[PDB]
Amino acid sequence: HKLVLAALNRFIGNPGIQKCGLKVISSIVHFPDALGAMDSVLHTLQMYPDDQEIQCLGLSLIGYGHLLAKILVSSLYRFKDVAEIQTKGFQTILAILKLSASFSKLLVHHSFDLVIFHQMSSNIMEQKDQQFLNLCCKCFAKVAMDDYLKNVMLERACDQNNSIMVECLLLLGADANQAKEGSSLICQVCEKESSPKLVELLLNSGSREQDVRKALTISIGKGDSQIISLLLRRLALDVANNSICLGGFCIGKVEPSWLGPLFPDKTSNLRKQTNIASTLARMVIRYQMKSAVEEREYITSLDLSANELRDIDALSQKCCISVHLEHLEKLELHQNALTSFPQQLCETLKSLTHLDLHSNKFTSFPSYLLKMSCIANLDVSRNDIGPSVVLDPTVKCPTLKQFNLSYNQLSFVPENLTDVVEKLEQLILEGNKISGICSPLRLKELKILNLSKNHISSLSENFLEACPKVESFSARMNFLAAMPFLPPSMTILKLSQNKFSCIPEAILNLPHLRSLDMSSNDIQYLPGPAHWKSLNLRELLFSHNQISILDLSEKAYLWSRVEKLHLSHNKLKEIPPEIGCLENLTSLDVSYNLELRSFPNEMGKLSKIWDLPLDELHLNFDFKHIGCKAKDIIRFLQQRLKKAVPYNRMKLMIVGNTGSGKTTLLQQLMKTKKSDLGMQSATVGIDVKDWPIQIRDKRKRDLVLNVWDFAGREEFYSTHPHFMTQRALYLAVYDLSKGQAEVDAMKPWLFNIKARASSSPVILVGTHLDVSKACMSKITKELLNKRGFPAIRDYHFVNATEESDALAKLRKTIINESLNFKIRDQLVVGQLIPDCYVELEKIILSERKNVPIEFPVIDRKRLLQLVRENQLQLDENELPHAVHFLNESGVLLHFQDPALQLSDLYFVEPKWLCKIMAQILTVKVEGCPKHPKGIISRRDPKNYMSQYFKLLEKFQIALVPSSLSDHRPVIELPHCENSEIIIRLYEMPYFPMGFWSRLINRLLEISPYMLALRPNRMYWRQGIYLNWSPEAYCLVGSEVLDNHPESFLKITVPSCRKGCILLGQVVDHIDSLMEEWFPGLLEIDICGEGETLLKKWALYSFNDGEEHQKILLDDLMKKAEEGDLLVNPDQPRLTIPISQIAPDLILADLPRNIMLNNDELEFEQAPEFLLGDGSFGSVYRAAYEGEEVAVKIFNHTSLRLLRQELVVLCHLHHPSLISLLAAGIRPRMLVMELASKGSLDRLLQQDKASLTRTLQHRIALHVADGLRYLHSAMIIYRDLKPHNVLLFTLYPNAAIIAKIADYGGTPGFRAPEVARQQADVYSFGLLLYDILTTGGRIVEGLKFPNEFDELEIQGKLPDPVKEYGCAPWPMVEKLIKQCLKENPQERPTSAQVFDILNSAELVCLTRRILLPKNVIVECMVATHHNSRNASIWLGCGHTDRGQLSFLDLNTEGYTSEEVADSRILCLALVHLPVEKESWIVSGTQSGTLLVINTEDGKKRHTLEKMTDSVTCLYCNSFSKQSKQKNFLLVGTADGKLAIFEDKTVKLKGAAPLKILNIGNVSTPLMCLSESTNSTERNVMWGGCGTKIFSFSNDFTIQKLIETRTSQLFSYAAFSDSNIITVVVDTALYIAKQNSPVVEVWDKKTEKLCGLIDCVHFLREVMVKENKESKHKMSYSGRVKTLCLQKNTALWIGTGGGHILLLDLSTRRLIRVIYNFCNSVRVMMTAQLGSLKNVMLVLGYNRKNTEGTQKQKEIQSCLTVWDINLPHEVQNLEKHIEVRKELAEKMRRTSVE
Ligand SMILES: C[C@@H]1CN(c2cc(-c3n[nH]c4ccc(OC5(C)CC5)cc34)ncn2)C[C@H](C)O1
Ligand SMILES: Nc1nc2c(ncn2[C@@H]2O[C@H](COP(=O)(O)OP(=O)(O)O)[C@@H](O)[C@H]2O)c(=O)[nH]1
């Protein structure tokens, strides 16, 4: 019982008894392992806390419900640091967790954090219980198992400021951008007044930039000077570029105490005290993996434009930066609201040369801005400068160049220019209010004046009489009358919008003038080219004048260079033929004249014309179906210059109805005697026949009209519209037996004749007198004549079987009607064509005398062979029109239609192919009607069955829409309550025949409605009724309402949100058809009234449901109700939104947020407010509730086009796309993002100082991404060029830099056009080329612009670095070539080019130099003393004897010169500060140490001949003699340090100061190094044999560290071999011959503190991409050389074809950059041409071209990397990830 009694007695013993009871139970707990005390021993703790002597015991006994934990920490917290009782506690926790894992989560539940934080931070480090502390890292490692536990405790770890532990947690993961995304870590960390080290650690690791900006706003709220300067240093600083990009931020005020540390400071050097955190992180990681596995120096200018600086005086003082400003050389203050530029500032900075501050609110040009030392381009161009701007004459500033004064409120030209600004060039004064006549203006160097938009009366006669270099005087929009003796030097003169009456003779005589724009003048006579006295006229812009003649008869060749001639809006009469001499004409413009009417054939010689607007003028020809475009018009005018002839050979379409005198009247018109077939049957198809008529009269014109006796029976009634062209003479026939009743039923036919060919004649012909009613002439005169039916021109009553004069009269009438057609007096029947067409027609007809009957088609190859067989003058560009024209004449049908596919096949003999297309429509099936009537599958010879229905369903006969269930099946809509449906009518007098056949076939195949779920559809002849659901369905019905002889087209669609989509997408397909095939219907006949024959109604009802009637409304009149949005009757209390009865016209269908209310508008449209022109309209700027927002206004255009654009540009959200904000119906225009820094063309035109390669690459990458998305959206751009790319910010590493405008071409932007997909790739190639070029492609657009598609694969293209001089930039120079394949199949995809652009290597490298063929070189030395242009001196080893091998870099010219009798090993540079020379030294195989001068390759003197092979040379920094001093080291193959002095090199056989024999004959000296710092007096370290050594100015071995005696043998010879390399840093990194591992010694302890293996980094990559590497287990690959950067990383040069980056501080591998060489032999650092700190890499590329001959072809591929690589490989890495998250977050807005 003792256990039971002891426990219960200790329980009841509330006073005193516990102190002993606990000792009794702690002794007894070991022996029986007893069994119900835990609860009571728990209870007693609460029952009396606070007694240490029992607390320790209780904790000791807990280890032998959750309230347990609640007492534990509350104990350890109540005894934080009283004694080592925490030991017993943490032992208890460690015991409990290892058996109950989840209890750990319970511990952190209560208070664990409070006490563990305290213990790990109560200064426990270097206190004696370091082993107890090891148990506690062991605790934490299991504590931080759950990542969420890391994040939330991290949250708590920043609440209380604790730098060491927050750093430790960051090293353990625990991302710092997860808390709230609106109030995430940095926000409260700057709110709670934390420490700079706490904020810096948060910023350095993952911290989203938006949160940083929010925290910047917060920390601006308070006054903090060490947290602000750390937020800016991560938000705005480009250290690579020396910048401050503080642009977008809304900083309330700038104070130098913030930017203080942003400027570079040489004193900045900080120790390593946070190593505690790294050590603790290492211990935690160790315990975690154990628990896991088996348990000068001045910056550039400043960001300043849009900051609304109401004052800039803050910088005028003598503050911290008042000495860095003195070398600014560019200052931008435009668009702020400044005033009165501070006088102290404008003399503080004495090197400013682009000061521009416009759009500010100045009111007085300071006139003390001009006392700066070297200023130019002074620009104040939108301020409110006072009425006069006189310059004070006490300033003599000559350096000013471009003194802009645009758009001020001036009243005079500035007064004292001539005495102040002498060298002034571009004095601009436009937009002012200059009124009075100007000054004599004695400026000696004006080069571009300007006076536009002033109010000038006239110019003084001595205005330009003293400015002998003016070039571009341009006074637009003034009130100007004459010109005052312009100096003979003007080149460009622009004088538009003035008030002239004739070109003043002061212009007709300028001896060098080049362009003259005088548009919008009211002038009368344009003097002939014999009045212009100038040999170089290029542009002559004269639009909007009143010009009568275009005098060119006098002397035309004197204007042979003219390239632009704009004469629009003039009273011209005709173009004189002398215009044919201006061969260099490029852009003629004679539009809007309304009185020109004819083009002379002479213009066909002006082949350079690429545009020729034809707006509002009528020509002979110009008929759209045959009308040419651009050069095609010139080709037409040139072929018409050759020879145009009368063609005289037309058509007669006979038309009947189911029976009449048609065939028996055609067989009587043709007088056909044969009667071969004694019994003709009903007509099949159209049966084309032809019959010549040599009219035996004075007119010998033997006219041949072809008769097409159309099908009578109604069954053929769908194809006939195809054979009714506009050019014809139709008959029609009665069968007068059913007189006055058949004549009624003939009405549809005439109607169709009025539908297709409005201006075609018709001839009625009675066909029966033998069969009996002849009063039919009544009704044809009574009803049929002139009411909506075509221009009947006769009627006859022949027998059409035999014996009468009436037939002769019918013949005469037909002949005389044919010879009298002449529509619009154009006379079709004899019009002129090139004889080539007639020849082609003749040869084709003669092949109607030779073809296969089974397949009358001709292949295009056969046609191009038959043109060769004859002597036709046609090329591959003539046939595309030739065959079309011959199609127009009924010779052969060929299909070029975009709706189908272009036919390689040619349908000569149409007479049987029309016969073939109708066979299917007559074959029936009286077998088993297994399918509903009309639908059928493939059921019928040699491959012809394939082409038959490869034509017929291309002909949309497939399921035959004809003979298809005329009676409609009964259909009921889910909802028919008069208010959930939308209904639209199409009342028309009679359906077109193939209307339904082609209507149900256009709606049918559009399956992806509201995209890919197909609907169920049950479609009879005249209806569809698709359905997805009761939420989406459509019934395009066909009913006739009672007492309505017309025929309607009822469409019903639910008024739901998606139903409006159905409506719109169906009305588009029903309207576009009507204007594509039936232009007669939707042709408003102003003659009579606007019937339009197509009265598209709209049905609306006020009474929601049970309206008892649907109220009509004509759609046009409803469209007139667009000034509002709601319709309402004469009774105005109730109304229906137009948004409820026609949601398709209505704006709301795309995301509803697009709506412009016309309320909070803010706008202007003057010629400053547009931003550019493009496609179908232009774009302007305005504001609304916004500030700046762009508006795309439209021309002329239509709400067809806009509906396309609305949908297609919407529903597409992408970072590279220019998203639109709103649309405006009333204002007929759209709204877009304002592109802040301009367009790419502008950027190229101006800003070439500021295009970094990074930046160019960013733009290209952004663009590559947009184009990729556009192909994700499966579509062409078709508009890619500098004019179309928009730039937002000029900050290189931003998130949005470039975007792409208007969507699916130019001489400056050509391709081999598909119609003359993969094409946009090529267009991108052009843009990319120019971006690489920076303005080379169309600067030539001022010069030789036709040449832009002439050298198409052939131009400056072969070497554009060479052809433009731009900075070399490989990989992408290969990318454009490799992209730019002429064949579209050969081009890579846009996704592929985007992926290749997303490659840090494409951004990081600039050149290599493949040395001459088979040269082996193994040593090289750079030159930094002449840092202007440097040459890299190489050795050789292709020869066993020594050649030196010079190699320059700016010329890349290799030279060879044998200088030694034995192969060289190494060289070095010893430059002497005296005598200004750099002796170059070379050590060799024989020991013959050679020294040769820099410039002289003859003053050579080998020094003492060494004993063994010299392995090394080196030049040190040893100034130990109180002066500048240097030495030289000769590493030989034995260790003998033959040291010398910097100057003693000249004397033959130099004297070694201290000959230090170090190594042995078997231990070869093999590497030397200097130290990393200079504070250790440059202790020198050199490897020797296998033991590294060191020395100093003493030149005595200071250490004999041995490496072979290593205690970590994984292999021996990797350390048991001769040393190869040594580098001196905080530690030592060493490698040996063929050692694939590097050894890391320490200088003090001399211990192998590191062992870093190379193939330890080769595995990770090879495993996927090298499968043959599984056979290469005995791997080649080892450290062939070392090269260490200053403090960032270390570059391992492999013996293989690889290179390794090592971040020596924290993470081992940054990147391996392979596949660029095969053996990295040499590596070193250097400086070149102010591009200091480059790293040269001499690698090998062996070619086994003759490897079978045991020989390899060697190319020493010397490359030059930019040493800044280890940053960009980790910084650009990051930059992708940024844009990847943003790629996804943006696509969330597409979801919702
Ligand atoms: C420098 C000036 C130039 N600017 C622009 C803006 C734009 C522009 N923005 N948004 C657009 C949307 C469409 C668009 O279609 C083009 C390419 C057809 C002209 C242009 C812009 N295009 C040139 N320049 C903006 C102002 C503030 O700055
Ligand atoms: N007796 C008689 N028959 C005629 C006359 N004109 C046409 N027909 C008949 O019309 C038929 C000619 O075919 P047509 O009607 O032109 O062919 P369809 O239009 O394809 O049916 C023959 O059967 C003729 O006998 C006429 O004046 N007298």
Author numbering: 543 to 577, 584 to 612, 624 to 854, 981 to 1457, 1463 to 1630, 1642 to 1659, 1668 to 1720, 1726 to 1909, ...
Q: What does the article say, verbatim?
A:
In this study, we present cryo-ET structures of full-length LRRK2 bound to microtubules in the inactive, autoinhibited conformation. From dataset (2) (LRRK2I2020T with MLi-2 on pre-formed microtubules), we performed focused refinement from the map including both the microtubule and LRRK2 and obtained a 7.8 Å map of LRRK2 only, which showed the highest LRRK2 resolution after subtomogram analysis. Our model of full-length LRRK2 on microtubules is similar to the published cryo-EM models of in-solution, autoinhibited full-length LRRK212–14, with the LRR domain blocking the kinase’s active site. As was the case with the structures of in-solution LRRK2, the ARM domain is flexible in our map. In agreement with those structures and the proposal that the N-terminal repeats constrain conformational changes in LRRK2, the kinase in our full-length LRRK2 adopted an inactive, open conformation in the presence of the type-I inhibitor MLi-2. Similar to the structure of LRRK2RCKW on microtubules, our model showed two pseudo two-fold symmetry axes, one centered at the COR:COR interface between two LRRK2s in a dimer, and a WD40:WD40 interface between neighboring dimers. We resolved these clashes by shifting the N-terminal ARM/ANK domains of each LRRK2 away from its own WD40 domain. This suggests that a novel WD40:ARM interaction is involved in stabilizing the oligomerization of autoinhibited full-length LRRK2 on microtubules. The distribution of these angles in our samples peaked at around 90° (θ angle), leading to ring-like structures around the microtubule, in contrast to the right-handed helices with helical angles around 33° observed with the active-like forms of LRRK219,22. Instead, the most frequently observed species were individual dimers and short oligomers consisting of 2–6 LRRK2 dimers. In contrast, our in vitro reconstituted microtubule-bound filaments of autoinhibited LRRK2 revealed a stabilized N-terminal half (ARM/ANK/LRR domains) covering the kinase’s active site.
